[PDB]
Assembly symmetry: D3
Homo-oligomer: 254 residues x 6
Amino acid sequence: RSDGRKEDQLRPVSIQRDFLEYPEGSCLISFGKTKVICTASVIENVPNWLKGKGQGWITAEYSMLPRATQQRTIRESVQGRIGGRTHEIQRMIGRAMRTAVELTKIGERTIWVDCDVIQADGGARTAAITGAFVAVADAIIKLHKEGIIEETPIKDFVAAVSVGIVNDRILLDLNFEEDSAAQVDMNVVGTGSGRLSEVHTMGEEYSFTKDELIKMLDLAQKGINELIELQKKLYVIQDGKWERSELKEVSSTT
Amino acid sequence: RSDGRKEDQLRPVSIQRDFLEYPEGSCLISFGKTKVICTASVIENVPNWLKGKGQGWITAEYSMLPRATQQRTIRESVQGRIGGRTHEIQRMIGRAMRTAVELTKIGERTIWVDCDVIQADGGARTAAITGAFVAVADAIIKLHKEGIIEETPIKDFVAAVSVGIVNDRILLDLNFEEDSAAQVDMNVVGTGSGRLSEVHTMGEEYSFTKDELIKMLDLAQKGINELIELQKKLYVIQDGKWERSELKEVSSTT
Amino acid sequence: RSDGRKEDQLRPVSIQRDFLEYPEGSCLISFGKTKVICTASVIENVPNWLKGKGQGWITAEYSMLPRATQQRTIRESVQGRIGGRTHEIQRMIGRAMRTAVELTKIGERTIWVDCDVIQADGGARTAAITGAFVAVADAIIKLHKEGIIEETPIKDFVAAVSVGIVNDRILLDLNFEEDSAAQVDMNVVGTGSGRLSEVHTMGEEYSFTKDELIKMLDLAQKGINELIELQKKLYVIQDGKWERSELKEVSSTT
Amino acid sequence: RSDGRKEDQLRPVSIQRDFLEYPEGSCLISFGKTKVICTASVIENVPNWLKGKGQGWITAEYSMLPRATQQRTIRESVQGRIGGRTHEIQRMIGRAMRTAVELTKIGERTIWVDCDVIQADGGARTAAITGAFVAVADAIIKLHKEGIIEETPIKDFVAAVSVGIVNDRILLDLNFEEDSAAQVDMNVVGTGSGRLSEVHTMGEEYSFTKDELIKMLDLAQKGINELIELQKKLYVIQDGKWERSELKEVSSTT
Amino acid sequence: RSDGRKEDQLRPVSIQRDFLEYPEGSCLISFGKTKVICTASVIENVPNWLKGKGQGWITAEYSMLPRATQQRTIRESVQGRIGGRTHEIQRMIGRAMRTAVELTKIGERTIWVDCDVIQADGGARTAAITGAFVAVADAIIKLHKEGIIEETPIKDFVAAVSVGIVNDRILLDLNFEEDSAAQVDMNVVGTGSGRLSEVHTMGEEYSFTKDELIKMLDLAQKGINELIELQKKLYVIQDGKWERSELKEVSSTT
Amino acid sequence: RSDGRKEDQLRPVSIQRDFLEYPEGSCLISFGKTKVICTASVIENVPNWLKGKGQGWITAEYSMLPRATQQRTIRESVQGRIGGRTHEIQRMIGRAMRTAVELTKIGERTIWVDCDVIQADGGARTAAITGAFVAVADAIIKLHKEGIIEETPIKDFVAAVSVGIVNDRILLDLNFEEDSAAQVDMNVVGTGSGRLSEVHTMGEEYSFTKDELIKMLDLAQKGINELIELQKKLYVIQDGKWERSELKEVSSTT
C-alpha cells in the first residue's frame, strides 16, 4: 500500500474529547489525514411528529469544508443547488446514533450532532460516525451529571469503517486514492458487542461474490473492533452506568 | 404474512415491454401493487467530463407520483425543497445499469433511464432497477437494429429485491407494511451469473449479526434469480448477441 | 395532414378507468401518441384558508416525464429551477375540475388530481383535463359508495381540446409537429351542456380575426362534444345521481 | 359601477413617454389607480439559440411591488419560492411585443422590456402590455435615430384590455373588486388594424356561452381601439417609417 | 468633476411626497439620475417574535429594476439565486427607520417599507434611506390622522449620503462612474440633530487613514444636513407633534 | 466586564499555524471562546472575468457551524433559504485579503480562503479576518517555496477587531453578551502600518456622535495593533521578502 500499511491495518487513529467548550459533547477524530470535528448539542425540543410520545431524538448534520482530498468542496450557501449525497450520510449517522441510544430515557429533547470534515482523505463518513458516538455519549453523560436526566441511557458503542477491493486486493480503511481506484467498496457500522447496524457494498462497475462480501465484512468487523477498543478507553462503564475516564485523548499504537 | 404469502416468496411479478412507443426501450413492471414505468431514451451526447474518451454513459431519474402507499408524495416542482433521497436511488439505478453495460461499445451517447413509480407498496426501487434493465437492454438492441452501434454490448442481466427481518422473521420482497414494521431491512442488486452489484442493510434501531445478514443475502439472491429467470424469457442471447424474444409480456406463476 | 387525418378530425381516443388500484379514481387517457395517467386521491383535509367554510377543494399537479415529443423534459428535482409553465397548466386543470363540482357538497376534504404525461405528441394538457375529469367523477362516486358523502355532487362533464391555424388551415387536435408550425393555436375547455369553462388563443407572431377565432371555437366545441360523448359511456346518470357504467374502457371509432 | 363608470367605459387612461432617462424607451401608463412603469432597454446580444440567424429578440420581466391592491405582494428575493404566475404574464407580454415587431430587421440584439407595477387595482397586465408597446416602439425609433438600425421595423400598434361578467353584467376594464367578484373574466391583446394577438377567457367556477364570449370580445375590441387611438397620438407614421410626435403625454377624455 | 459639480456639492435633489395613492406614505426621491420610489405600507400585524411585547416594527424591501447604471440588473424571480447584497441594504434601511421611530408608540403593527430603484447612477441606497424616511413619517402621520394611533412617535429626521476618495480627491455624493473609480468609498446615515446612525467605509484595494476618514465623515455630515434641511420643508413639527406642510414637492437649489 | 476584563483589553488571543496538512496555508485562531479555522487553498484558475489580465484573485467562504453562541446555526444545505448575511462577511474577508496582496504578482490563480467558525462568542468575523491573513500569507510563502511564483507579494499585515458602546461604556473586542446588549457596535479592519481597510459602525436603535466614533476607532486601532504584533511573531520579513518564523503558535500574554 502507498503508505507502507498492511492490508488488514487501520491508519493511525486519534480521538480527542472535549475539543470545544460549548457543546455538551465534542471531539476531533482522525483516521490518518481524514479529520472530522464531531459535536453533540442538546436542543430542549423535539421534531413535531414526536411531541408527547415520551421520547427524545438524535439527528445529524454533515459538511465537508471546501478542501476535500486537497481539491474543492464548495458548500450549499455561496454555490447553489443542494445535492442529496450529504443527506445520504446525515441519515446514516443519524441512524447509527439512534441505534446506540435508548431514546425512551432521554426525555423530550434532541441531541443535535454536527459532523464537520475539516480534512478529507477517504473514510470521512466512517470517521464521522466513530467520532459522533464519542460526542453523543459524552453529551448524554453531561446531561446526567447536570440532573437533566436520570441515567445514561446508552446501549452500546458504535463505530464504522470502510473496506474495499483494489486490484483484487481486499483492503481495510481506504484512503482517497485507494478508494477512487476501487472495483468494490463498502462501509460498515458496527456495535460494541460485535453486532452490525449498517452495511453498504457497492460494485463500481464490477460485481462481486457473496464470498468476497463476507471476506470484506470480516475485515471490517475487525477494524470496528479495534476502533471500539479505542473508544472504550474513554469510558468507565458498569451495569449501564457511564462515566468518562480521565483520558482526554486516545490514539492507536499504529 | 398479510397476503397469505410464504416467507421466501416474491409477490406476483409482471413485466411488459414496449409499454410506450417513443423511447428506444420501455416497460411497465409490477411487484404486487408496486408499479413502475421504466423508459430508456437515447441522447446523442455525453456528460462534459466524458467528451472524447470513446465511451457512452447511463444515468437515471426517479420520481414517485403523489400517491405512494396510498398517501401523498408531492414532487419537487409545486412543493419546494429538493430532498437527497430521490438522488440516493437514482445513483443506485445508475450504478446498476452501468455495471451491466460495456459503455466502451455504446459510442459517445447517453442512455437516459426514467423510472416513474405510479403506485407504491414497498420495493419500489428494486422494482425500478429490475424494470430499468429491461428497458436499457431493449434500447441497446434497438440501437443495434438501427445500425447506430455495431453490437449489443450488454454484459449480463441485472435485477434487485428487498428483504428484511420482521418480528424476527426473515421475509423476501416486503410490501409497505412489512417494511415500516421491520427491525432490519435490505436491498440487493444482483446479476445473471449470480454475482452482486450492490447491497445495503440497515438496522432500524436494531442491530443484526453477520449470520442474519448472510441468511438475508441468501434469500435475496434466490429472489434475484427468480426475477432474472423472468427477464430471461424476454431475450434470446447467443455469444453476447442479444435479440428480443417474441414475448411482449412475462409474469410469474405466483 | 401528416397522419391522413381530416381537418375536423380528432386522433384515435382511448380512455381506460381503474388504471391503478390505490387512488379513489384513476385513468389512462390517450389522444393518439399523447398519453396521460390521471389520478384523483382524496386527502381528508382542506387548504388553510378554507377550514370551517363547509366546503371541499380540488387541486392539480402536472408533470411531464423526460420523454416529451421524443426529446428531453427533465423535471424539477435533479435539474434545478422551477418554471412557471407547469403551474399555468395545473391552475387550468384545477379550474376545470372545480367548475364541474359542487364543492359545497364534498365535505371538508380535498381531491388531489395528479396528471402524469408519460408520452407527449401535442395536446398533452387537453388530454389531461379530459382524463382528470373521469378520475375525479369516479373518485366522487367512490366516496359516495363508501358513505363518506351523501350524494355525487358532480355538475357536468368537462373535456378539452386544442385547435389551431397551420398554413392558413384550421385544424382540430394538433399533434406536436402541427403545433410547432402553427401561426395561431388555441385550447378550449368545455362542458357537457355545450357551455365553456376556458379558452385561450395565442397568435404565434401572427394576429388573427374575430372571425377566425369563432371558426376555431366552433371546431373545438365539436371536438369537445365528441370527447364528452365518449366520457358519457362511462357513466349512468339520473337526476344528478352518478354511477359508473360497466365499461372499463371506451375508445373512439376513429 | 362603484366609480360611476358606464359598462362599456374604460377608466381614465394616461400614458407618459420619456418617463426615465436611461432606457431607449420608457413610459408610465395608468388605467385608473393601476400604474405600471414600462422600460425597453437594448442589450447588444441575443439568446444562445438565436445566434447567427440574422434576427433580434424581445423578452419581458414583470414585477408587482408589495403594494398590490393595497395588500402585500412580497417579491421573489426576501421571500423564497418562485411562482409561475409572473412567468405566465411575462410570456404574454413577450409574445405581444414580438408580434408587433419584424425582428428580422432589428439586428442581432435584444430589447429587454421591464414592466413594474407600482400600484395595482386590476388590469395590471393589460396596462403593462399597452405601456410596454409604447416603450418598445420608442426604443426602436431611438435605435434608428442613432444609426444602430436602418428602419423602424414596427408592424403595428398593440394594446390590451380586460373584460368580464359580474352579476351577469358584461363590464370593460375591471378594477380589482369587480374582478374578484367576477363569474367570468377575460384578457384580450389586439392590434392597430383591429386584429387579435391573444385572448384568454376563464370561467371562475361558472361556465359561459359562445355568445357571451363574443359579446365580451366585442366590448374588448372596442376598448383596444380606444387605447390604440391614444397610443397613436404619440407617433407620426408614414409608409412604415415611425417618428415620435411632440406629445410627451396623452390621456383619455374620460 | 464630470458634471461640473464642486467636490463638496450634492447633485440636484428632488423629493416628491404622495407619489402613489394606496400606501400610507410614499415618495419619489432623486439624487441626480438616481431615482427611487419609496413606499410605506401598514400591515396590521407583527413578526412572530414580537407578538405581545407592546411594540411595532419596521422592515424594508429593496429592489433594483434591470436598468441599473444603464446595464442589466435581473431580479430574483426569472433569474435564479438570491444574492445577499440586496439583503445587506434592506437591513441597513430597516435599521435607519427603526432608529428614527419610537416603536413603543406605534402599536402592534408593522410599517412595510418598499424601496424601488427605477434608475441608478450611484448613491441608490442612500437615496433610498433619505426617501424611505419621508414615506415612513408620512405614514405615521397618516396613521395618526386616522385615529389608529395616539401620537406621531417619530424621534428625528434620518438621511444618508455617500462620499469617497477618487484620485486622492474627497468627493461628496458619488455618481456611478466616480464610485467605480474610487479608491475608498463610504456611506453615512445621519440624524436631524447631527448624530449618526451608521457608517461604513471600505477601502477598494487601498487603505486609508483615521484622518482621511474624518475628512470624509465631515463632508458627509454636511451633505446629510443639506438633505435634512430639504426633508424639513415637508413637515411642521412642534413638541414632537408632526404634521405635513403644504409642500407636495421640494427640490434643491443645486 | 463579565470576565473581569478591562475596557481596552482584548480577550486571550491564540493563533496556531499549520493547523491542517492539505491547504497551502492554515490556522486555528481564537479570541476567547470564539474559534475559527482559516484555510487558504490555491486553485490553478481565475474567475471568468479575470482570464488573461495577468493577475490573480482571492475570495472567501464563511460558515458558522450550528453551535453559535451555544444555540443553533443550521447551515444552507439541510435547512433551505440562503441568507445574505454570510455573504456580507465573505465579501468583507475577501476585500481584506485582496487589499493586503499585490495580485499582480500572484499569477493567474486564485487563493480560496475558507473561514469556519467552530465556536462563536462574538467577534467571529474579526477573528476570521485576523486568522485568514495568516493562512493567506503562509500560502503565498508556500507557493514561493515551491517555485510556483517569483516573490512573496504580500503588502502588509491585516487584522480586525470589534468595539462598541454598552451602557455608555466603550468596550474593545465584545463577547456575544456584550454585543447583544450594545447600543452601538463596530468592526474595524486595519493594516500593519496603522492604516485602515474597512470600518462599519451601526447604531442599534441608538445614534452616536462623530466623537464617540473617533473614541471607538482609537480603541479599535489599538486592538488591531496588538493583534498585528502577535501575527508579526509568525514571520521574518525583509525588504518585502517573507519567510515564516519557527513559531507554530503565538498567544497573547492576556
